[PDB]
Design brief:
Chain C: This is Reaction center protein M chain. This is part of a larger assembly, with three copies of chain A, one copy of chain B, one copy of chain C, one copy of chain D, one copy of chain E and six copies of chain F. By secondary structure, chain E is α+β, with helices and mostly antiparallel strands. Chain E has helices spanning about 10-35, 105-110, 230-250; strands at about 5, 10, 65-70, 75-80, 90, 100-105, 135, 145, 155-160, 165-175, 180-185, 190-195, 200-205, 210. The termini of chain F are far apart. Classes of the chains: A mainly alpha, B mainly alpha, C mainly alpha, D mainly alpha, E alpha+beta, F mainly alpha. At the C-D interface, strand 3, helix 2, helix 3, helix 4 and helix 5 of C face strand 2, helix 3, helix 4, helix 5 and helix 6 of D. The complex binds bacteriochlorophyll B (2 copies), bacteriopheophytin B (2 copies), menaquinone-9, Ubiquinone-9 (UQ9) (2 copies), all-trans-1,2-dihydroneurosporene (3 copies), 15-cis-1,2-dihydroneurosporene (NS5) and 2 more.
């Protein structure tokens, strides 16, 4: 076995076509999530500022 | 009624588009 | 059905071969006999038995204990033989009922209790030695001895150790059918409900665990008995289709498997752990926790329910209550 | 993903229902029709617990509880939060259990082994059914069943048992308890004995089947023998529930007094009373 | 002031709790589970992508090797690398990881699926003396049937069809268990004895009923090498054949109920 | 590739229709059921009953 | 075995016939959902604006 | 490498897309569910119900 | 294909009609029962019973 | 080595990226969950709910 | 054993390409965490100064 | 040896770095947790919460 | 023996480092813990906490 798909492999090219899409969609998902979080913020601003007493 | 409540639309809609577009 | 897993259809008879020990091949005792009925579930042959020293001793102390127990039980019905036999489950040998702390209590109130306790302890031990020695005699490993050990220790915990750490013999388990059981409730009531003690939990877990495991292992072997999977030791040294299937079966179901050898470890481990878990709980109780429920509430583990009938304030705490 | 010897056994067929469409493995798990079904219940049933627990008053894992409906609702459906979800889950539960058991049957068919395993698994299922279904039918309410909740369920067990005045005396219980103990002890011995023979310590040679026999015939003077222990294990295990089931069903439908009072039959035979 | 109080909220019980847990998991994981990987590991892959390492966390996984010194000479080392080199007569339905396989020829003879055996050591199973463990009652003359049972010697063996396959020649006994393992029957039509595991036949008063396989396929039950003793491998071979018939005797045994 | 932009489609070389399909099917349905149930467990956003919420009314 | 359908590869073409439909119908389903979601909104506006107290 | 800068991609030679892809699927589903239910278990931040909050009111 | 447009039909190559259809038959039956019994467990939208929903009255 | 300093990297020849990667994923997830849930179980430091913290007030 | 991959050391190169990325990603993560921790400080300054009594 | 003084290092020829490494990881993690939470279960030395200490004041 | 005075070292031939080392490690760890917590359960000798002792005070 002296290659990358060395002597009749069960087969994975150097396919980083997968890597391309995988990263795209991972970012898209995270991007969408950001926007969505912003939208919600305007619906229900969730953290709150620090109250009268606190500390 | 959906007034600045686009929240569900944003969630449902946005992916709907890039799902359409990324995998053409 | 396959009848050959449930009972044995055709029984075999023939010369049984004795494995010669390291010592005490001489102290085997009795004419070995057969039981045809017993032969339908297991081996039919019933003798002989090893004797030797540990045995002698175990019997010695054991019997003395039994004698003291029974004798005192008789004395409870004033020796009326008929009544004895009718009332037997309700009779017992009780530990001390007054508070003497840890002083050796008077004969008539717990004294005899204590003596039998000590002798029972001694027999257990002598026996332990038997188990352990015999193993070594025949060149086996000592696993059984160690499991047995834990069991014994738990007996110690509820018998004298716990009494000791809180410092009163009054907390001992009594001898007798029903009364050893009444102990359970008392003990639980006193330490604020045992369902709420975590080690009681653990223990039970492992105990049910054993149920599950034996049922499973048991069933598994029978299911593969057709390939001679009951021949468990040869399967360890030379893996056959039998246990290959057995493994596969479990893998395809819960998604990981054991080996023919290691399943035994699991079982052995679970068994042990019942007794250990128990011992811990017992040791903690009285010593560090006074009321297990309240403790679970302090750590907010305890479920709380709304009132069905109106909620009831304790009358003791009202204005102008008696005593 | 495969054990070194796994492949030769991974063949098609021996599904109980719906043939080839579900006949596949996801990783090490075999799916099959009932695989699919199980999952569905597990997923739905668990989710349902969560949602239900969300509208509880706590999120402590011990303290969470989904209780069944009040007694007034009879054998009917209750409002979803006032006992309905209980009902829901209980079905998903049964669902899951049974799908689990049948899956096992499919598996064993495929391997040409016996069905002992599935069947054995049937016993606890039955007890579940006894406690959640039958006994409540016989008393005519769901409110007689037990709630889902780690500590919560024990509270049920606890009170139930004090409803007859000292459950320890209930004879079904006695038997079951005895089995529970014997089983545990026996697993210990079986465990140990194999292990001792296999791993005899030092460079001592692994021992034979005869040494297993000798060992016990020494200590207690009888050896049940190698196959039969397996057989016997299965038996002990199983009567934990088989006998108990009797004591459980009895309490309420067939006995309403304290359990100790029941031994009166013997205590009171007029001859020696 | 309280016994067992480490703070205003922290008590010795509470700490022990975790402690207990810790141990349990440790044993389970760092021990028991390792011990479990003494057979069939490391995992093998006939589709996936450049993998010399199972579920991750695990290629340590395998424990260091034991060495069973055997009762009648020799050593075995565990885990091992025992390679399967039989060439299986199984075609795949799909090329897929976990899609099932179809037998190409006769599955009962090609020994696949429920009809597959393990390649055990080609030696005779032995007693503590050094005799053969599994033998017939022609050899173990000292052994006998218990008085009160049916001697199956002489009876007709009826197969799945309702057709007499042949007649019982002998029983075979385990000498170190006092237990009967095999019926040796005489397959009628040919001049041969075949060995059936006793777990595959319901013994009656008049007949031995064999649900496992059909009458015609008794002709092809694997042949014994010697006449009076059986090797460990031959045992597996014989057993697997009948069990394989539980899926492969009739075409309908394949199929689901509907 | 019949006028394709991406390699996307190669996913089905790797993944198997049958399994993806059967999976989605379960998944979607469970979630579906979940939401329906949940909603109809409430007071607001239960259709199917009289306005239990007693929203201000009593 | 030197291909994707490597010497009688057992019946899965370069089929992006499946991809096509899969992706269409995945969009349709999400699109439908959007429309439906909108309609429900009109019948029961479910998020609700932030009340008199809150914060 | 078709215009690549790192070797990032070689991960997929080692790790198996299917394992990752499928696993994230489950994982995300869970966290999703966690947050959703968690939120709908409060007072502030529950949509789906009439304001149980009693936000300042008593 | 007999005047077709899509390859959609190719599904029945991958799926087996008979045992798809057997499965849906069951599946639907369950949903069916569910909805029915559900409805008939209310007060509004229970046919099979007097209106004990007591709509406003009492 | 592509102009390194330490042997550091040899670790991956010994250890297995896959294991490390998967493990870390889990480990971190748990710690994360602990902190989050832990925080959200206090009275200070809980976003999500009204300040039933009652900081000094009552 | 007479080589680095001595008669196939079973196919993981001298890849410290992994090591390279691994470290980069591990630092980014740790860094981002700092930034984040700093912002949150501004929302809820969590340690608190030592109270009027204490010791 | 590459400029060494002791035999120390021969430990790794006896021990197995992988299993040391993994075990440390756990142990430290445990002790870490133990302290952290232990501390957060006192009154003095709790950050995360309003001073329940009531140090002498009440 | 490399300039040794005793036989002591032959222990390692009888005994095995790896077992010793691992056992000690644990034993010590437990004792350590015993002491630590034991102390932190008194009233003198508890750092970590307010002076619960109320040493003579009250
Ligand atoms: C109201 C009171 C209850 C109670 C009271 C209780 C107490 C007080 C204790 C337990 C304990 C246990 N409980 Mg519980 N319990 C258990 C099960 C268990 C066991 C797992 C475990 C006891 C260990 C054991 O197996 O003893 C059987 C094994 C024994 C006794 C060892 C015997 C070995 C010995 C060597 C025997 C050989 C003797 C010789 C032959 C000598 C012959 C004598 C001669 C000399 C006269 C279940 C399954 C349930 C259910 C289902 O509700 C339950 C409910 C209750 N328990 C009620 C809540 N239980 C123990 C425990 O775990 O506590 C934390 C324990 O201390
Ligand atoms: C104060 C009240 C008590 C009490 C009340 C009591 C009741 C009312 C009952 C018992 C029962 C039993 N009690 Mg008792 N009990 C027992 C032991 C026992 C068991 C032998 C027996 C059956 C347990 C059972 O029903 O499992 C239940 C297990 C079931 C139903 C199976 C569930 C498994 C399911 C099929 C599969 C689950 C899968 C999971 C959901 C999957 C999730 C896992 C992960 C991997 C996803 C002991 C040893 C003691 C002691 C030592 O005191 C004791 C004390 C008491 N019991 C107290 C006195 N007990 C039962 C019995 O048989 O009574 C005669 C019973 O009804
Ligand atoms: C999870 C762990 C489980 C576990 C584990 C294990 N358990 C073991 C072992 C392991 C590993 C053994 O190795 C050992 C053994 O070997 O078994 C094969 C044993 C044992 N566990 C026994 C009983 C048991 N295990 C129980 C429980 C659990 N175990 C827990 C649950 C329970 C319960 C639950 O109540 C019971 C009752 C005995 C069989 C045996 C002790 C013998 C003894 O210690 O002897 C002591 C000797 C005597 C008492 C002398 C007998 C005297 C006679 C009767 C005569 C008296 C008459 C007198 C008046 C006059 C004299 C005249 C005379 C000639 C007539
Ligand atoms: C006497 C007979 C004994 C026995 C026998 C056998 N035991 C078996 C088998 C045999 C033969 C198997 O073949 C089978 C198995 O696969 O081997 C591991 C199995 C199994 N026994 C499990 C648990 C187990 N055995 C118990 C008891 C005994 N076993 C008795 C003692 C107990 C007790 C006593 O509490 C438990 C908890 C699972 C691990 C496993 C099935 C997983 C499952 O069922 O999948 C299907 C379901 C799930 C994976 C989750 C279910 C989620 C549902 C939908 C909803 C949530 C649950 C809800 C009902 C809330 C309740 C919680 C509340 C109480 C707080
Ligand atoms: C990669 C790819 C193509 C992806 C796309 C595909 C995709 C996403 C498809 C859709 C997914 C679908 C449809 C389904 C998902 C998979 C599926 C069916 C999952 C079911 C999973 C599920 C619910 C699992 C939970 C497992 C479970 C219920 C319990 C865990 C086990 C527990 C707690 C057991 C109790 C503990 C216990 C007793 C341990 C015992 C130890 C063992 C191993 C005992 C068993 C055992 C015994 C008892 C023996 O006697 C024995 C004798 C001789 C040899 C071996 C053994 C042996 O192993
Ligand atoms: C092979 O290596 C090994 C050996 O050989 C070397 C060993 O010997 C050994 C072990 C050595 C030994 C001596 C084993 C013996 C150890 C034991 C604990 C045996 C003791 C067993 C008992 C005492 C029996 C238990 C009895 C009790 C606990 C008392 C119960 C009290 C009562 C009132 C019970 C009342 C009810 C009953 C008795 C039965 C009720 C039954 C039913 C209601 C239904 C029955 C169900 C069935 C028959 C199954 C259904 C039928 C079919 C499926 C065909 C091991 C471990 C090892 O593995
Ligand atoms: C495609 O998506 C789907 C799958 O694949 C993903 C599935 O696998 C499945 C699973 C469907 C199957 C038939 C799986 C195969 C069948 C089995 C494994 C047998 C086990 C199934 C069960 C025990 C129950 C399943 C049947 C149902 C849930 C039908 C529901 C019936 C009714 C009346 C619900 C409506 C509620 C009422 C009328 C209120 C009155 C009724 C009650 C109060 C009863 C609740 C109280 C109890 C104690 C329940 C006990 C009774 C039972 C458990 C039957 C579904 C549903 C899904 O469509
Ligand atoms: C050619 C080739 C074969 C085919 C290529 C075809 C293609 C491109 C296939 C890939 C397409 C797709 C679908 C890619 C999808 C990528 C995805 C889904 C990436 C997802 C990444 C998700 C991540 C990183 C999630 C991180 C989540 C966390 C850190 C959660 C933390 C939660 C907590 C700390 C607790 C909070 C909970 C609480 C209650 C407060
Ligand atoms: C075989 C080949 C040759 C021929 C091709 C034949 C063809 C084209 C077959 C295809 C036809 C069909 C039926 C295609 C179907 C495609 C489908 C069903 C796609 C479905 C996609 C579903 C998706 C992406 C679902 C995402 C769901 C979520 C993110 C749910 C999240 C839920 C939460 C976060 C929690 C909310 C719960 C709560 C608040 C209680
Ligand atoms: C294969 C090769 C050729 C191709 C290369 C492909 C590449 C570059 C793969 C690498 C990409 C990725 C994803 C790299 C990821 C690296 C990562 C995730 C590193 C993560 C490191 C995480 C660390 C060090 C975490 C330390 C955590 C702790 C110390 C937690 C301590 C917690 C406590 C003490 C208790 C506090 C809890 C409390 C409640 C008080
Ligand atoms: C330091 C000093 C002064 C003393 C130390 C003493 C010491 C070691 C005390 C510790 C005592 C211990 C361990 C006590 C333990 C007591 C326990 C666990 C008792 C538990 C259960 C007993 C039960 C159920 C017994 C009931 C017994 C009977 C009904 C009668 C006995 C008869 C039999 C079992 C039948 C056999 C008789 C037949 C052959 C005729
Ligand atoms: C309460 C007692 C229960 C103790 C827990 C039992 C351990 C279950 C075994 C899980 C095995 C994990 N796995 C898949 C990595 O092998
Ligand atoms: C399975 C038995 C249930 C009881 C276990 C008690 C759990 C304690 C962990 C909860 C955290 C609260 N604590 C201890 C800090 O107060
Ligand atoms: Fe066994």
């Amino acid at each position: 076995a002296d290659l990358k798909p060395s002597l009749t492999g069960l087969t994975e090219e150097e396919a980083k076509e997968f890597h391309g899409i995988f990263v795209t969609s991972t970012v898209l998902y995270l991007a969408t999530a950001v926007i969505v979080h912003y939208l919600v913020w305007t619906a229900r601003p969730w953290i709150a500022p620090i109250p009268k007493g606190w500390v | 009624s959906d007034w600045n409540l686009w929240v569900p639309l944003g969630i449902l809609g946005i992916p709907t588009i890039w799902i359409a577009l990324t995998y053409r | 059905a396959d009848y050959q897993t449930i009972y044995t259809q055709i029984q075999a008879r023939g010369p049984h071969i004795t494995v010669s020990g390291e010592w005490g091949d001489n102290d085997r005792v009795g004419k070995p006999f057969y039981s045809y009925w017993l032969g339908k579930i297991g081996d039919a042959q019933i003798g002989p038995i090893y004797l030797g020293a540990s045995g002698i001793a175990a019997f010695a102390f054991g019997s003395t204990a039994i004698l003291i127990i029974l004798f005192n039980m008789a004395a409870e019905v004033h020796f009326d033989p008929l009544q004895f036999f009718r009332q037997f489950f309700w009779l017992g040998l009780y530990p001390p009922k007054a508070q003497y702390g840890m002083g050796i209590p008077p004969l008539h109130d717990g004294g005899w209790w204590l003596m039998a306790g000590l002798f029972m302890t001694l027999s257990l031990g002598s026996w332990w030695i038997r188990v352990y020695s015999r193993a070594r005699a025949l060149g086996l490993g000592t696993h059984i001895a160690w499991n047995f050990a834990a069991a014994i220790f738990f007996v110690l915990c509820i018998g004298c150790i716990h009494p000791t750490l809180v410092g009163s013999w009054s907390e001992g388990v009594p001898f007798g059918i029903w009364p050893h059981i009444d102990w359970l409730t008392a003990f639980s009531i006193r330490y604020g409900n045992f369902y709420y003690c975590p080690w009681h939990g653990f223990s039970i877990g492992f105990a049910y665990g054993c149920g599950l495991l034996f049922a499973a292992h048991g069933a598994t072997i029978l299911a593969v008995a057709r390939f001679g999977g009951d021949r468990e030791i040869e399967q360890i040294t030379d893996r056959g289709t039998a246990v290959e299937r057995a493994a596969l079966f479990w893998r395809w179901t819960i998604g990981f498997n054991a080996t023919i050898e290691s399943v035994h470890r699991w079982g052995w481990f679970f068994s042990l752990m019942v007794m250990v878990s128990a011992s811990v709980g017992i040791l903690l109780t009285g010593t560090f926790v006074d009321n297990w429920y309240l403790w679970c509430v302090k750590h907010g583990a305890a479920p709380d329910y709304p009132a069905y009938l109106p909620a009831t304030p304790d009358p003791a705490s009202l204005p102008g209550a008696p005593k | 993903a495969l054990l070194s010897f796994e492949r030769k056994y991974r063949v098609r067929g021996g599904t109980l229902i719906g043939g080839d469409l579900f006949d596949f493995w996801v990783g090490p798990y075999f799916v099959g029709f009932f695989g699919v079904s199980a999952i569905f219940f597990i997923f739905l049933g668990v989710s349902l617990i969560g949602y239900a627990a969300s509208q509880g008053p706590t999120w402590d894992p011990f303290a969470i509880s989904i209780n069944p409906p009040d007694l007034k609702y009879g054998l009917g459906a209750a409002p979803l939060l006032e006992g309905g979800f209980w009902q829901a889950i209980t079905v998903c539960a049964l669902g899951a259990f049974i799908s689990w058991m049948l899956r096992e049957v499919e598996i064993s068919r495929k391997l040409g082994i016996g069905w002992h395993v599935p069947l054995a698994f049937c016993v606890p299922i039955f007890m579940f059914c006894v406690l959640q279904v039958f006994r409540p039918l016989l008393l005519g309410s769901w409110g007689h069943a037990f709630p889902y909740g780690i500590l919560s369920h024990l509270d049920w067990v606890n009170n139930f048992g004090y409803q007859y005045l000292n459950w320890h005396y209930n004879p079904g219980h006695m038997s079951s308890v005895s089995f529970l103990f014997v089983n545990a002890m026996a697993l210990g011995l079986h465990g140990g004995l194999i292990l001792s023979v296999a791993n005899p310590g030092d460079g001592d040679k692994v021992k034979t089947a005869e040494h297993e026999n000798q060992y016990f015939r020494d200590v207690v003077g009888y050896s049940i023998g190698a196959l039969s222990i397996h057989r016997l294990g299965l038996f002990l295990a199983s009567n934990i529930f088989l006998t108990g089931a009797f004591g459980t069903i009895a309490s309420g439908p067939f006995w309403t007094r304290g359990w100790p009072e029941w031994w009166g039959w013997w205590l009171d035979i007029p001859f020696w009373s | 002031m309280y016994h067992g109080a480490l703070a205003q909220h922290l008590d010795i019980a509470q700490l022990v709790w975790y402690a207990q847990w810790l141990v349990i998991w440790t044993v389970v994981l760092l021990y028991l589970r390792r011990e479990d990987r003494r057979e069939g590991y490391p995992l093998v892959e006939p589709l996936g992508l450049v993998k010399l390492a199972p579920e991750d966390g695990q290629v340590y996984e395998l424990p260091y090797p034991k060495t069973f010194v055997l009762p009648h000479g020799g050593t075995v080392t565990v885990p091992r690398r025992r390679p399967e080199t039989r060439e299986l007569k199984l075609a795949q339905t799909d090329g897929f990881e976990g899609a099932p396989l179809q037998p190409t020829g006769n599955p009962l003879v090609d020994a696949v699926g429920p009809a597959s055996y393990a390649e055990r050591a080609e030696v005779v199973d032995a007693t503590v003396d050094g005799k053969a463990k599994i033998v017939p009652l022609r050899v173990a003359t000292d052994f006998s049937i218990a008085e009160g049972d049916v001697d199956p010697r002489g009876l007709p063996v009826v197969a799945a069809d309702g057709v007499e396959a042949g007649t019982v020649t002998d029983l075979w006994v385990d000498r170190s268990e006092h237990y009967f393992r095999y019926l040796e029957l005489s397959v009628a039509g040919s001049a041969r004895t075949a060995l059936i595991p006793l777990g595959f036949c319901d013994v009656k008063k008049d007949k031995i009923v064999v649900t496992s396989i059909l009458s015609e396929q008794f002709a092809n039950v694997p042949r014994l090498q010697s006449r009076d003793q059986i090797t460990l491998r031959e045992e597996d071979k014989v057993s697997a054949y009948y069990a394989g018939g539980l899926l492969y005797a009739t075409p309908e045994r394949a199929e689901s109920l509907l | 590739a019949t006028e394709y932009r991406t390699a996307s489609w190669k996913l089905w070389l790797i993944l198997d229709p049958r399994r993806v399909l059967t999976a989605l099917f379960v998944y979607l349905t469970v979630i579906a059921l979940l939401i329906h149930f949940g909603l109809l467990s409430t007071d607001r956003l239960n259709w199917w009953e009289f306005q239990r919420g007693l929203p201000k009314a009593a």
